[PDB]
Amino acid sequence: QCVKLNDGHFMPVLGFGTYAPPEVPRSKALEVTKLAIEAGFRHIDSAHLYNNEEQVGLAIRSKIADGSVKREDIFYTSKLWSTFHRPELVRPALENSLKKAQLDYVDLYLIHSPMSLKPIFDIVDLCTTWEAMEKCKDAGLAKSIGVSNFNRRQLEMILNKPGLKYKPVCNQVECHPYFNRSKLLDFCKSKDIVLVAYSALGSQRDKRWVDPNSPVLLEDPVLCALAKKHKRTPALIALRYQLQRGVVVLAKSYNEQRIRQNVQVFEFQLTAEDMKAIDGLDRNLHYFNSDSFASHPNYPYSD
């Protein structure tokens, strides 16, 4: 089920992650997004950067056309890529995403990252980008607007903007038991901003971005022991951890069995001692860790 956002709309608390790397054929996103909807997912997370909005959109329209769901039962997110932070570019970028997906609106549009790129880094006052996001909500192109990859200071930037019209409903950020974002979660909760966790199953470990020496979250012994205790799986422990701390959680799978398994997160719960054991895993490990952005001026992890 769902959480009420600070603008009055509702967001399902489990979301289907749609990114797959370039070597995966583009048609696969169609197949797996249809399987997700069948399995029970109602929140679908995409982005311009994912080069899959056409296929993800066709999956959603297909499941509407066969009568499985109504458009209003689906919560679709897209994201403004970082070459489009200049405010005059924000509405056209969102209109392009809508045209690719063949939708009239997105349920949620995010600023994908604070790290602006040449429309090579760019310097852009993200307050101005945010005003343009607000106009997209006023026009009905996005029911809700939010940000992604912002740290506390960068969110405060927006919350403290003179003439602010809409707070971000959410901040979608890397978050899992090795990097659990407790303090940022407490700050988001204090401002009625939902934290949405990505790489909640430990990421896809892409060689472009992730050190292969980094520990593999789903092989963690504490998670494996809890999975045995509950006769579930390490992935389900990881997802359930997030729901119990009030985090909305995404889960990418392009495998039919695991897609179906991930919806079991609703079927069990963890005790306080389990939760404390998980919280014990925090080690400041963001799987994104590359020179390609660690040196950006708005890199979020420099705080």
Ligand SMILES: NC(=O)c1ccc[n+]([C@@H]2O[C@H](COP(=O)([O-])OP(=O)(O)OC[C@H]3O[C@@H](n4cnc5c(N)ncnc54)[C@H](OP(=O)(O)O)[C@@H]3O)[C@@H](O)[C@H]2O)c1
């Ligand atoms: N805003 C941003 O900057 C940002 C960044 C990263 C991610 N995202 C969003 O968040 C989504 C999820 O994050 P993510 O892509 O890093 O991957 P993730 O959800 O952490 O998943 C990592 C891997 O877990 C595997 N998996 C899924 N279910 C499993 C299960 N039950 N058992 C064992 N393995 C399981 C999947 O492999 P299989 O496909 O082989 O199952 C997936 O590749 C993305 O697809 C995208 O929508 C956003």
Ligand SMILES: COc1ccc2c(c1)c(CC(=O)O)c(C)n2C(=O)c1ccc(Cl)cc1
């Ligand atoms: C661990 O997995 C990650 C981490 C970062 C990612 C992505 C995936 C994707 C892929 C996606 O969005 O699914 C994008 C576009 N990332 C960023 O641009 C990014 C770069 C640096 C920081 Cl600090 C934060 C975000």
